Amino acid sequence: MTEYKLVVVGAGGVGKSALTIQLIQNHFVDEYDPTIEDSYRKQVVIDGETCLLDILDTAGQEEYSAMRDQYMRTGEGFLCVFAINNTKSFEDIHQYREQIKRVKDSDDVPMVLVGNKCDLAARTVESRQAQDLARSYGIPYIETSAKTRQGVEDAFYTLVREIRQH
Amino acid sequence: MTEYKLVVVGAGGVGKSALTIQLIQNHFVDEYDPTIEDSYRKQVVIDGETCLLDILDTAGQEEYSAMRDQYMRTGEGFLCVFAINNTKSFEDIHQYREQIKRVKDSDDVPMVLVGNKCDLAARTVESRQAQDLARSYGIPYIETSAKTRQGVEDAFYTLVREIRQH
Ligand SMILES: Nc1nc2c(ncn2[C@@H]2O[C@H](COP(=O)(O)OP(=O)(O)CP(=O)(O)O)[C@@H](O)[C@H]2O)c(=O)[nH]1
Ligand SMILES: Nc1nc2c(ncn2[C@@H]2O[C@H](COP(=O)(O)OP(=O)(O)CP(=O)(O)O)[C@@H](O)[C@H]2O)c(=O)[nH]1
Ligand SMILES: [Mg+2]
Numbered sequence A, B: 001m002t003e004y005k006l007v008v009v010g011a012g013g014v015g016k017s018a019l020t021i022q023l024i025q026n027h028f029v030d031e032y033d034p035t036i037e038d039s040y041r042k043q044v045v046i047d048g049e050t051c052l053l054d055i056l057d058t059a060g061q062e063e064y065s066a067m068r069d070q071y072m073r074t075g076e077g078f079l080c081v082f083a084i085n086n087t088k089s090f091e092d093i094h095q096y097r098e099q100i101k102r103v104k105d106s107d108d109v110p111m112v113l114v115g116n117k118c119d120l121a122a123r124t125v126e127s128r129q130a131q132d133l134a135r136s137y138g139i140p141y142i143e144t145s146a147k148t149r150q151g152v153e154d155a156f157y158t159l160v161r162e163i164r165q166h
């Protein structure tokens, strides 16, 4: 079957893992548990196509920024995640997109810009700012909440459809 | 606020109305009720943006194919709907896309190809066939069920994001 190799990247603490576990295990993780590297594989049916989601959940931390090259080379699509209550994480996006373009030798790589933790009221990144950024990259912007599950399927399945159209 | 003028088109009986009412009124209509023309307006929040969905629900029938020109000229994005258990409706898609391109003087108009009634088992249109068609048009393909609500938000919000990126 068709397999889609998806990679979830973004700064430390933005909710990369909570998003992925919401998708695979249907529950919200609320505990401190820094990721090194985790793989999840799941058979799903998207828009009638039977397929396998091979998802790589990555570390937010800097140790070995060049060990990101290896998982960036292999990934077919990327969810670039920031948290709407953390401005630095939004600013960091630029660095992950440039690194992905650099290792994949490409100005258009399947990507979705995800603004997570949209359930929180202490918002510091405006949606308009993020939508403008997404538009300059030519990629979708989706807001999600791993807490309420709002937008999680949408974020992942839109990325699969972007890969379908590459 | 930003308003998005969406238009739902497709052959008679494919579920254009049931899709729209699922979205606006959250329930499945299961009765015979041919549409002439209906408007629905709803304030929503999509990916953090407050906006108004102005949705036009159209007739499947032929009387006045040129009275489609008027609503095609004004629409910003189109959901092109067929039913996965009705091959003729899938074939009819081509005619609605060509008419939209013709009146909007454009080879790329915000559009989503929707394969509705995916809950039904008597499938006559394969997903692969539809995905190939969608790919040749360069637009997303989404399967929906107005009966189970599967994919309805996805179909509409993906169309809004396509308008955002035009
Ligand atoms: N309110 C709320 N909290 C969230 C959401 N997603 C994640 N969190 C919380 O943020 C914290 C960090 O989540 P986690 O998934 O571990 O983030 P990470 O980005 O994967 C962390 P690391 O980079 O080290 O691997 C946790 O307390 C988690 O419950 C969300 O959508 N909303
Ligand atoms: N199983 C199932 N039935 C559906 C679904 N969507 C619509 N239907 C059924 O199909 C029939 C036609 O639906 P309706 O919404 O009236 O279709 P229409 O395309 O709007 C008809 P018209 O073109 O004349 O305006 C109804 O019996 C409705 O319940 C669906 O997703 N699955
Ligand atoms: Mg993690």
Ligand SMILES: [Mg+2]
Pocket (backbone or CB within 6 Å): B016, B017, B018, B033, B034, B035, B057, B058, B059, B060
């Ligand atoms: Mg109708």
